[model samples]
Target: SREQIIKDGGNILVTALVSKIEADLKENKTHYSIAAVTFTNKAAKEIEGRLGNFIGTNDGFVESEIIRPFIKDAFGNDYPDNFTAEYFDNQFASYDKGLQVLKYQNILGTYSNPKKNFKFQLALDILKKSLVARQYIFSKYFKIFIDEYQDSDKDMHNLFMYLKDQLKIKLFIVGDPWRGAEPENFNGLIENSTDFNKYHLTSNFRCCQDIQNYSNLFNEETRSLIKEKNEVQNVISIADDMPISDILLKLTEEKQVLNIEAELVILVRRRNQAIEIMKELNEEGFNFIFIPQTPLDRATPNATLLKEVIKYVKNDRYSIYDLAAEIVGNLSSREIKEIQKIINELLVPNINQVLINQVLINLFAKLEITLDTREITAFTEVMMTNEFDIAFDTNEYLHKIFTVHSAKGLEFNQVIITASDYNVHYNRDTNEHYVATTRAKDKLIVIMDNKKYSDYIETLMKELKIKNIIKSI
Candidate 1:
């Protein structure tokens, strides 16, 4: 639950901040505050990218005078006397400690940085105000498709209401309010009334029946997993003494005869935790991909790959072997070397983005590697036309690093999640846990450290009759 909020909190938090900033504090100082000046709109988004899994509990990581009081009321202001600002900066090392510490309750749940979250919210509210400016934008699009709408703030909630009721536009909202209700609860948020209707997906097409039941269990529902295409295994626990990398390596292997079409996701709760797993994966050459666990707008595998490929056109030494493994795993060392050799020899003297793409396509075709159809569309939209996308998708390939919260609407072939929830409520966190387990329509693999909540998860598994859902390793 915390990860989910933190993962998606950026947009809402930013808008909230923008909405709340208003004008200023008396006649004392110039502008709103330091964050208001620095984070503006674009700068705030950049900061959010730097702090990965460090989003949820530390929603207000960027302190702002404008949002100071609002955060206290929203998340609570209880704190020890010793507590100070910049807690995340001091409480943990590097980028991930902020989340790790709060999830385990190591520090009091007194996180008070709402600067970035409010920033995005405020920005959105500005749009909701003006008449023609607003309707012109809403009417410009075919439909308003919002993912994880459960996390919408009050103003955003109202904005949607206006678009649907006022403009008579079709609205498609996808999200479980029971999870990732960041900034605040839905409070029966978007009213499904005369203008709109709501739908619930009862059958879990992803994961096994057991995991699906667990997903339904938290909602206090009486039904079991009604349908399934995959077999659900018990939630496996790893001993703190066992090397997680060793265990994971044993599970994943180099392709022997056939190519592995499946993907393996290791969704961690912290950036440093992800870093550690990646180091092990990199050292072992486990034949997997580690996509960034952030939003689509932030820098990620596809964005980096696109940049590197462009650099490769300039005879740059950026490596794409890991990328080849990501696209078509089981490429022989010699094969990867050959692809690099050809890319190195190829040259396009003029800086024509389209020609560069075609040449790159020719090279990629030789290796039997192709871009996602949507990615190709996005590439053409950006290069050949005047359009932009925050980022592209490379996760459809071999592996991914996901935040359970971030993966609300997304799914994978197989999932390997880390149970790192401590501060989030059990019921709400249950929905978060549910999505993590069900991401894989083919398989579900849950691994825990210190193997926390083994007994708790075990009892729940038993009641649901999720066979092979728990094991001590």
Candidate 2:
């Protein structure tokens, strides 16, 4: 989905998909149609109308129209349909076209409705089509730059290989493979390849030099072949006297000194621990948000009940026993009766429309006089606005508390990576968790709960000692 971009108080298309195509169109106006064909006919028409051009094609004719122009107009540019000069010359194309063809051929005909075989076939098809398209593009345009290249899929790698073999396009790929989600072989597309230029951007400006060095030592054993070449600098080490409580207090006290806002982040390793910390923080009058990993664990009882109700509404074979259990857990028998009445009214023969919020608000209003603060109001607010979806967007909200998993691709001025206990085994195989600890740019404070620490962390501390950074915190 495209992120909503606001320009002068008006929403504009700033998503990678839209902006990239626009950038290409601005560079080569004549090539927009070629790019438009990659997208559906409906999408092409929308772009044409927005740019004041006539894009003539239905879904079936997109491929042919993309390759061949109707005639060379007075502007000396091929006119697919008369369009404004502002339009991009190249059009958007589907990255999954090959997969569509395979599906059409019934390559996985024997598979069921949500077939894994079909999914695999589709993936293969996408890869093949992308490879072909990549070669074609490189043959025409010799200069190619790939951003976030570490996340490229198998098909994308194949595409790059084809490009290298055919036209040898000058390629520039930028990404942090250590922080990538894909598995080893899939993520490291150009590990030993000579056709591409590689660069490392490990110098974190967010943390001080001490913190940077510590992060380096933690990830040194699992270093990326490309990133290790860059000299690590800008580190910060916490003062030895600082306790975990002081560190938490300092987050609020030295907010400006740390160059962070109240909404700045303090990341943790686990959700249950975060909840405990949050409860303690709240008791101490600290305001922050905690996003739990499991939606079921975080959802309000009523929201959970409603979810079950919807599921039963969709499929009659599903039972309401589970929902009834939730009701018994959350509400008194009288309140439960009221809820059942509401449900029954919605299911009545003459009731044509089902308004979700109306039912929820009525339930809340009925219970408001008797309910306590712990009795689901927090969950009610969460469900009414559907803020679960809101949490998906990335923005600088003053303070954030998250786990290593949720903190990927995120950086902070001050980062606290807890569970530095030596006896606790750090899963070295989990590249993602390791990368999370390195996300800090300014300050890194590792809290060890064990006397005999993790051998890995001990080894790292020794390395830091060699770097003249043995100051404790």
Candidate 3:
């Protein structure tokens, strides 16, 4: 704690002057002693190491002659390690690094090192702290509408609480009872809350009776997590071994005359399976698109470029040239070939060749690109076990494909639920199977490898199958 130092014990240790000495002179007067413990055995040596690195060494190792005896007698192992010189040096007492963090400055400004978009978070925190900026947030953003509120996690608690308290802002949060898959996502707010008025939708206008009724069959088995039901029956199953390419051809065939007004989409469980189907659809000259499954937004060109770069680093499917292409936009095919030739033969550190991610980061540094350090770290970490990327589609198309989880919040007129295998005995598959059926508007179709696929899944698939469901196409 910062205070006026009175009696100095050594260079660092001092006693904080207090009024207790004056009080002790009279009735109830007392002599108060506040000892400042600046114990440092290894800390002094490490400090010099840091200082040498911080500002190239000078005759500054000068303190060692006097510090040696001081270190042995006053600041060595005899001093309690719990009360460290690191703590005594700080201006305040905080369990979490105190003023050391606030006082230190990085290249940009602050020392708070967050893992993502830290600059943005820094600016947000600054805004929240400022007197004038606080008013701006309340005035400009009067009400907060939190969509997919079930997805709100602990990270959102502070912001939500702040908005409601300071600005008295109204909150309109909407979400499904059982939707989010992330363990960190909060379920309590939407599931059970009495803070505001609640409304349970009596009717679902988007999904037709067939899709609705079919999706509802899982409610009881799953303990009534999903409760909506309708009267129409319009869902069926195909052989698990059925060619996905054939499924596409049949669905889009000219004679298929059901739900002409709505969109048709195939929602699959596996990306490798989807990729194969996508490749087959492409080769057949079929007019279709396979949405790349990326975590970053495909709508943003830079994010798309980063995602592809990550994929290239992780999967090696996309070439380094491919990763560099989008980033080095406006490059000709000749330029790509030229760059690839150079990349094929390049010098690295006197070291053996660095790995792909390190190599790319080195390239990035040389290019003087400014990227979030956390983001680069995330990309490298993801390389070990990366999910196939998912990208968004804005263009209108007749047929679409979605991985069951990816189809969240999206409803198509018709849904084809396909999976390589449904490990129904496993609880995860059953829950997702329920979720997959609920993504359709007018009809639902499940393509399977006959019954007995997995006794549990087979029974559920049979229950969903509408007899003679596939209209000849």
Candidate 4:
């Protein structure tokens, strides 16, 4: 799991799911059905992409064609027909178009009769199709395993229970409670359940002992929860060090003293501090990556692409040159020069912005661009016309990065908890802070200034006996 987490660099929770399943199969578990469902469109897409063409197919066919054959090759028939893959893509679909309506109307269920609502009814159909397929496989196998079971959707979980009751299939579910129990997630599966099979994996194998101890101090429940699984080791103490600034200098010196990489990480509690640290890091030429609540591609693509396109448009020589280049790629040099002359005459000085705006309006008029709230607001302001100031606010075509709230049930490695100070705190909720901090698999680098470190985090450091306080340059 840790290896996959590092390989992916982020999306640790999903990697954990993959890890758990591999472990289960290694232990000779048979006839397992795993389901990982999150509200995140990205998560859905990731699963769909990795699982290949098996998704949306019946479980029996997927098991027979994909899972069973793979298992036969790997484990020599120890657990054939052990896994089934299915997905529900309707959660994020818009109701405006008749596409959703068509999808909902076609859904069927296995254990129960068809549902009344078209949307939910379609979900039922998919559930029944999966359950029946699983049942056929279970008839030939013994046990069932589920990874990241806590992230399964309510309907999916209900279907699983129906399978357990009706088919008597054994189930083993594994997931991190700390990372799973968000309101919009699979929390309902664990929170109010009467099952006693719940267990936690508490060892601090990922971070330095000091960092682990510091993070452990924040939430007693999480500490208690994980302690139930394994003994905590790998603890480091950095107490008795100098003041924050002096400690940073010494740490830098120690980097030289030990001839090690300059890979020190500082975690803080507010945004102003993050900004300050980022400025310092930029000045120092440190190579760093910030994993914001939204993924980079989703967050910046429009602005980034638009900015590049604008830069190309603004270059007087390159504007015509690029047009000629494109034309030359498709046409002869004579045709290239002819098209470039026409476009250059049409795009005169002082009218470039106007032409760009007109082209943008036309290009995006038929196309959709999804953005998170911040990006949406920014795009709205930039793409505004008198009549369409908020045209894409409710547009279903635009693809948006998942919101911070939507990213709650996920994890990542080397997480830099930004905006850690009090003055620039973006999230006021304690749970949000908890969610963000726990997202880190190995390093929890908080970027904050002097004032923004929360009183809670300060008290946490003291309680954890952390002494190596460091400051940004």
Q: Per-residue alpha-carbon lDDT of model 2 for 359-457, expressed as tens digits? A: 545654543323334334443343334345324323345656777666665576656655442223444434544555567765555554444344555
Q: Write the per-residue lDDT of candidate 4 for residues 1-473, one digit (tens) a residue.
A: 24433233111222124344344345544444443333332333344554411212123332343334443343244332432121222223332332232334422112211121222323334334454444454564333444445444444455445545555644444455411123333454445555423343444434444344545555555443222113232222222235444334443465222111433333444334445555655456443322232222233545443422333443443443343222101223443454444344324554444564445554333222333445444433333332221211222311112223433554444444443322323335456555555554644444343344545556644765544432232
lDDT of 2 at 312: 42
Q: Can you tell me which runs of candidate 3 are displaced by over 4 Å?
A: 1-140, 146-160, 172-230, 233-308, 311-355, 359-414, 418-443, 447-473
Worst 10 residues of 1 by lDDT: 9-18
Model 1 residue 385 CA deviation in Å? 19
Model 1: how far is 5 from its true place, Å? Answer: 35
Per-residue alpha-carbon lDDT of model 1 for 191-298, expressed as tens digits? Answer: 424433434444353345555654454444633433322443433445444566666754554211111456677776565676777778767656554444332223
- lDDT by residue for model 3 (174-213), tens: 4455111232333554345455544443223345544545
User: TM-score for all predictions?
Assistant: 0.35, 0.42, 0.39, 0.41
Identify the leading candidate in terms of lDDT: 1
User: What lDDT score is found at residue 179 in candidate 3?
Assistant: 16
